[PDB]
Design a protein around this ligand. Structure first.
Ligand SMILES: Nc1ncnc2c1ncn2[C@@H]1O[C@H](COP(=O)(O)OP(=O)(O)O)[C@@H](O)[C@H]1O
Ligand SMILES: Nc1ncnc2c1ncn2[C@@H]1O[C@H](COP(=O)(O)OP(=O)(O)O)[C@@H](O)[C@H]1O
Ligand SMILES: [Cl-]
Ligand SMILES: [Mg+2]
Ligand SMILES: [Mg+2]
Ligand SMILES: [Mg+2]
Ligand SMILES: [Mg+2]
Lengths: 456, 105, 456, 105
C-alpha cells in the first residue's frame, strides 16, 4: 500500500507465554496488528476429538491479558486463529469465556467477532457423494462411516472471513480453525499490501520466535511489510533473525518449500531471496501467490478405545539385555491368566534408552545401563485396559527371567499409584480437502464485550 | 576427503508436515557448501533409506530449495500422528540418523 | 490328630494370578488350608490413603473363584489377609463384594468371617497422649496433626483374630490389614503345630512362588509343617525350591534376618537350617518364636497435593548432553511466565537412560543415545499442577538450547494428549507401634453367604 | 587377580523393608565363598557408601546371616516410599552399584 504494515506475533501458540519485556519493547515499535496462532494439528487427534485444549487456560488468559489491554488501549486490532487449540465450537467458546473474564477484570469494553469453523456431517456426506472431497498426500480415501464416527469436524478458514469481521469494526477477532498465515495476512491484504508477501510473512511469523535463533516457542517477533518485501525482527537481545532462521521457518512443517498451498491459492517461492539487514534482522522479497479454485481442508477424529498406562525403570543389565523376550513372555502369561481372546486389545511398550523415540527405525540396537519402560494398553473399555495393564505390571514386576540375580522385584515405579488411567483415545479420521460452497461459508458474529459481560 | 554433514549444516531436524508425513530439513551455513553437496549427488534416496531402515522407494521426495541453501527430505509417516503405538506425535525427534552422514569430496 | 499340616499359597498377592495347572496339582496334594496375602504397603501410600486397590478386580475375582470353589468343595478353610490390597474398610468391602458375586455365579453357600482392621483416630490420639505410641526405625515422631490429617488408619493383626474366626466355624476368613505370616500360621498354630515353624513357614510362603526359583509372583507354593520342621514345594516342573531360594525369602523385605518382629513376638532365626530334600524341595528347621508384650503396627497416609505429568523422549545428543541445565532454565522460564510463588509447587524430572532409577545415587554419570523425560508437577490444587505441567511441556518442547540444530521441537511424545492428570497424591503419615488394649481388639463377624446374597 | 562379587553370589538385590528402609541382600553360592568374604573384612560400610554416593555413617547395619551364607546391608531410604520425588516406590532396582564389587583375594 504505502510505507509499512507492522505485525506483532507475541508467541508461537497463544498460551505458550513470552517475556513481559519482549512484549513491551514490541509495543514501543507501534504495531498495526497484534496477531497470534492459537492452535495446531501437531499435538495429535485427542484435542479436536475430545473438544479439549492442548494449551493452558491460565497461560492463554495471561497472554491474552497483555494482548487485549494493549490492542484496546492503542486501537490496534487483535486477531487470533484456531481459538482454543483446535478451533472447533468448544475450543472457540473456551477462549471466548477467557476473553470475557479479561474484560470484566480490566474493566474493558470492545467489539469481538467470533468466526466458527465447524462443519456439519451432512455437508461432508453430501460432498463425498458429489465428488467434492480430495484426500491429501498419503491420506486414506474418506468413507461415510469415517465421517459418521468422527466427532467435531472443522475447516481451516483463509483470509476472507477475518477481513469481513475486521471491516465491520471488530476490535478483537476470535477465529475458529484457520490456516495459520491467514490470521496475520488478512488485515494488511485488505489495506492494499501484497498478498504473496503478506502470506509469506504470516508463514514466517506463525510461530513467532521459533523463526529466530536461538529459537523460542515463547518470545515475540514482528514482520514489517513494505511494498517490495518484509523485514523480520525480534525484541530480545539474546535472539536474532538470520537468513537461515527465517528460511528454516519457511520450510517448517511443509512438504514442499517451493509451493505452500492454502485456501484460495499457493505461495510460489521460486523467486524468493532472504537477506540479512540492520542488526539481527532479515529482509524477505520475491514471494508470489497463485490463485487456485477455492477449497478448504477438513480435520476430524474418532474415538478408538480407552488407555491405561504405567511407567517404571529397570537398572539390571541382565533384565535389560533380555528385555524384548521378557516382555513377550509377560504378555503370553497375562493372556493365559485373564483368558484374553480379544484382538482389539493393543499393548504397546516404549523402551526409553534403547528405541523409545524411533522404534524400528532406531539405528542403535543396544540399550545402555538403564531403561524407562512405558507400557500402555488400549482396549474397548477402560475396565479392560485397566485389567490388562495391572496384570502386565504385576507380572513384569516379579517375572523370573533367565539368570536373574535381583530376585525381589524387577521395576522402579516413580509413582503411587503405579497405573494411570488416561481415558479415551482418538485417531485422526478426516484430513481432506472439500470444494468451497455456500454451505461452507464462514460467517462472523460480533458481540460487545463489557466489564459486566456481553451487552446487547 | 571425508567431510561430515554436521560440520556443514546449521539445521538438521525433523517435524511433521501434517499427521501423515515426516519432513527432514537440512539447512547449510553457506551457499558454497550447499552447492558442493547438491552437485555431488551423494545425498540420495538410497543413502537416506539405509540410514532409516526403510526401502529406497519409501523416500517420497528430496527437494533442493536453492533460495534457502536447504534440502528437504519427505517421507510418509508409517504411524499416523497420534495413532495407537506412536512414538513421536509431533514428529520432532526423528533426525538422528542424518547426524552420521559423511560426504567424500 | 494329624502329624502334618499342609498350606497352599496360590500366588504372591491375591489377584496376581497363577497357572490353572499349578493350582490343580496343588489341590491334588490335599491342603489343610488355602491361604493368601491380599495386600502390602510396598505399592506406596496412595492405595491406603485413597481407599483403592493396587490389584485388579477381575484378577482378584479370577483367583478367588479357584480358591473358594476348591475350599468349599473340599471343606478346606480359605484365609485371606489384607483384603483388597490395603485392608482398610473400603478395601475389605471391595473384596467382600467380589466374593458375594462368586457365590452367586458358582451357586455356593458358605460362612464368611470379616475381620476389620480400621482404628478410629480418637484411639490413636489417646494412645499418643498416654505414651503408648512408638515410631519404627527412621520414622518421624507422631503428632496429633498427622493423625488428624490422615485418612484410613489400620492396624496389622496377628494370628489371634484369624483363630477366633476359624474356631467359630468360618469357611472363608476375610481379614483386613494383617501381618502376612499370620494368614498362613494361625490355623496350624491353633491345631498344636509349633509357633516358630508355622510363622517361619508363613513368612517363606507370603509371596508363594517368589520363594521358588526361577521365581514368579504368579505361581503356587506349599509348606508342609511336621513335628520337626517344614517342607517347601512348588507345583511347576520349571520351578523348584532351593536352600538359597527359601533362605532368600526369609530375608525378603526385612531389616534383620535373625529377628523378625510381629504382633505378639519375634521370630528368632539364629538356629534355622535349610536342607535340600527329595526333588526340588527344601526342609526348614530350627525356627523359634519368642513372645513380646503385644503391640500393633499402625499405617496411615495423608493427601499432600495433586499431580499432572508428561512423558516424552529426546534423541538429540546435544540436548541430552546439556539436559540438566536445560531443565533448570525451563523451570526458571515457567516460574517467571506464570509468576509462580509457592514452594509447594514441586517439579520432578526422571531422566530414564541416565539416572531415572537411582537419582543422586546413580554411579553412571553419562547418558546413552536416548532419554525418556518423565516430568511430574505436584501442587496444592489440580488446576495449578495442570497449568505448570502444561507450561513446562510447551517451554521444553521449543527451548532454544545452546548449539541446537534440531530446531523444530525437542520432544517425542508417545501420546495425544501429551499431559496426563493423575489426581490426588498421598504420603505415608503413620508407621508406628501402638500398645495393645481392649479398644484395639479386632472383632470378627460371620455372615452366611448364599447365591442370593446375605439375608438382611 | 580379584574375584568379583558376581562370580561368588547367586542373589544380589534390593527391596524396601517398609517405606522407610532399603535393604540389599547378597546370598553366596557356597558357604566357603561366604566365609572367605566375611573373613576378608573387605565388605565394609565405607565400600558400600562410596558405591552409593552416601556418607559411611548412612549405612545402618551390615548383617552376616550365617544360616543362609547371606549378607544384608540396611540403610534409611532418603526418600520415603511414595513421597513426592521418589524414583523407586518398591525399592526394587537399587542393587546395581554392588555389581562392580571385586574382592582382593
Ligand atoms: N485449502 C487448503 N488446500 C491445501 N492444503 C491446505 C489447505 N488448508 C490447509 N492445507 C494444508 O494444511 C496445512 C495447515 O498448516 P497450518 O495452517 O500452518 O496448520 P497448523 O496449525 O497445524 O500448523 C497447510 O500447510 C497445508 O498442507
Ligand atoms: N506388631 C509389630 N511389631 C513390630 N513390627 C511390626 C509389627 N507389625 C508389623 N511390623 C513390621 O511391619 C512389617 C510388615 O510385614 P508384612 O506383614 O509382611 O507386610 P507387607 O504386607 O507390607 O508385606 C514387619 O516385617 C515388621 O517390620
Ligand atoms: Cl482444581
Ligand atoms: Mg497453527
Ligand atoms: Mg502452522
Ligand atoms: Mg502383604
Ligand atoms: Mg510381606
Amino acid at each position: 500500500m504505502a510505507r509499512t504494515f507492522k505485525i506483532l506475533s507475541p508467541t508461537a501458540i497463544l498460551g505458550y507465554g513470552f517475556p513481559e519485556e519482549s512484549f513491551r519493547k514490541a509495543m514501543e515499535a507501534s504495531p498495526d496488528l497484534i496477531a497470534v496462532d492459537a492452535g495446531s494439528s501437531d499435538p495429535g487427534p485427542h484435542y479436536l476429538g475430545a473438544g479439549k485444549p492442548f494449551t493452558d487456560r491460565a497461560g492463554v488468559k495471561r497472554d491474552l491479558r497483555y494482548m487485549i489491554v494493549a490492542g484496546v488501549k492503542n486501537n490496534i486490532p487483535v486477531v487470533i486463529g484456531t481459538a482454543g487449540g483446535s478451533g472447533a465450537a468448544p475450543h472457540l467458546e473456551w477462549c471466548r469465556q477467557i476473553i470475557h473474564e479479561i474484560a470484566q477484570e480490566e474493566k474493558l469494553s470492545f467489539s469481538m467477532a467470533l468466526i466458527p469453523s465447524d462443519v456439519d456431517k451432512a455437508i461432508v456426506h453430501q460432498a463425498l457423494d458429489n465428488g467434492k472431497i480430495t484426500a491429501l498426500d498419503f491420506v486414506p480415501e474418506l468413507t461415510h462411516e469415517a465421517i459418521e464416527e468422527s466427532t467435531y469436524i472443522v475447516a481451516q478458514m483463509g483470509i476472507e472471513p477475518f477481513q469481513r469481521a475486521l471491516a465491520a469494526g471488530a476490535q478483537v477477532v476470535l477465529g475458529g480453525r484457520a490456516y495459520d498465515p491467514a490470521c496475520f495476512a488478512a488485515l494488511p491484504i485488505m489495506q492494499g499490501f501484497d498478498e504473496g508477501l503478506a502470506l509469506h510473512c504470516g508463514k514466517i511469523l506463525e510461530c513467532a520466535a521459533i523463526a529466530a535463533t536461538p529459537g523460542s516457542g515463547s518470545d515475540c517477533a514482528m514482520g514489517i511489510i513494505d511494498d517490495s518485501g518484509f523485514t523480520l525482527k525480534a525484541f530480545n537481545p539474546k535472539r536474532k533473525f538470520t537468513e537461515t532462521s527465517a528460511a528454516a521457518h519457511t520450510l517448517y512443517e511443509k512438504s514442499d518449500p517451493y509451493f505452500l498451498p492454502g485456501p484460495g491459492g499457493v505461495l510460489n517461492l521460486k523467486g524468493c531471496t532472504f537477506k540479512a539487514v540492520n542488526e539481527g534482522e532479515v529482509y524477505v522479497s520475491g514471494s508470489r501467490h497463485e490463485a487456485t479454485p477455492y477449497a478448504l481442508k477438513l480435520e476430524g477424529a474418532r474415538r478408538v478405545g480407552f488407555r491405561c498406562l504405567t511407567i517404571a525403570g529397570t537398572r539390571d543389565p541382565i533384565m535389560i539385555a533380555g528385555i524384548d523376550n521378557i516382555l513377550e513372555e509377560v504378555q503370553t502369561s497375562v493372556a493365559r491368566n485373564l483368558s484374553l481372546n480379544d484382538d482389539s486389545i493393543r499393548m504397546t511398550f516404549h523402551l526409553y534408552g534403547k528405541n523409545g523415540v524411533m522404534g524400528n527405525h532406531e539405528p542403535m540396537k543396544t540399550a545402555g545401563h538403564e531403561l524407562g519402560i512405558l507400557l500402555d494398553v488400549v482396549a474397548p473399555t477402560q475396565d479392560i485396559a485397566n485389567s490388562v495393564c495391572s496384570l502386565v505390571r504385576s507380572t513384569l514386576l516379579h517375572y523370573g527371567y533367565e539368570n536373574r540375580i535381583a530376585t525381589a522385584g524387577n521395576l522402579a515405579f516413580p509413582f503411587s499409584p503405579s497405573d494411570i488411567q488416561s481415558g479415551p483415545v482418538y485417531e485422526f479420521s478426516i484430513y481432506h480437502l472439500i470444494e468451497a460452497s455456500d454451505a461452507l461459508r464462514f460467517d462472523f458474529h460480533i458481540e460487545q464485550v463489557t466489564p459486566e459481560g456481553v451487552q446487547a | 576427503m571425508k567431510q561430515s554433514l554436521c560440520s556443514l549444516a546449521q539445521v538438521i531436524r525433523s517435524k511433521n508436515a501434517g499427521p501423515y508425513e515426516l519432513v527432514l530439513d537440512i539447512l547449510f551455513k553457506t551457499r558454497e557448501d550447499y552447492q558442493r553437496v547438491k552437485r555431488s549427488e551423494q545425498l540420495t534416496p538410497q543413502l537416506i533409506a539405509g540410514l532409516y531402515n526403510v526401502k529406497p522407494d519409501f523416500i517420497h521426495r528430496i527437494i533442493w530449495f536453492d533460495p534457502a541453501n536447504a534440502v528437504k527430505i519427505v517421507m510418509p509417516r508409517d504411524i499416523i500422528s497420534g495413532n495407537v503405538g506412536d512414538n513421536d506425535v509431533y514428529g520432532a525427534q526423528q533426525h538422528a540418523p542424518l547426524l552420521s552422514i559423511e560426504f567424500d569430496f
